[PDB]
Amino acid sequence: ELLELDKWASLWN
């Protein structure tokens, strides 16, 4: 996963 906006994952868990 080379997604930079993946930091939003904490907003769904």
UniProtKB/Swiss-Prot annotation:
Protein's cellular compartments: Virion membrane; Host cell membrane; Host endosome membrane
Membrane topology: Single-pass type I membrane protein
Assembly with partners or alone: The mature envelope protein (Env) consists of a homotrimer of non-covalently associated gp120-gp41 heterodimers. The resulting complex protrudes from the virus surface as a spike. There seems to be as few as 10 spikes on the average virion.
Cited function: Acts as a class I viral fusion protein. Under the current model, the protein has at least 3 conformational states: pre-fusion native state, pre-hairpin intermediate state, and post-fusion hairpin state. During fusion of viral and target intracellular membranes, the coiled coil regions (heptad repeats) assume a trimer-of-hairpins structure, positioning the fusion peptide in close proximity to the C-terminal region of the ectodomain. The formation of this structure appears to drive apposition and subsequent fusion of viral and target cell membranes.
Name by which UniProt lists this protein: Transmembrane protein gp41
Lineage: Viruses, Riboviria, Pararnavirae, Artverviricota, Revtraviricetes
Gene name as annotated: env
Full-length numbering of the shown residues: 659 to 671 of 856
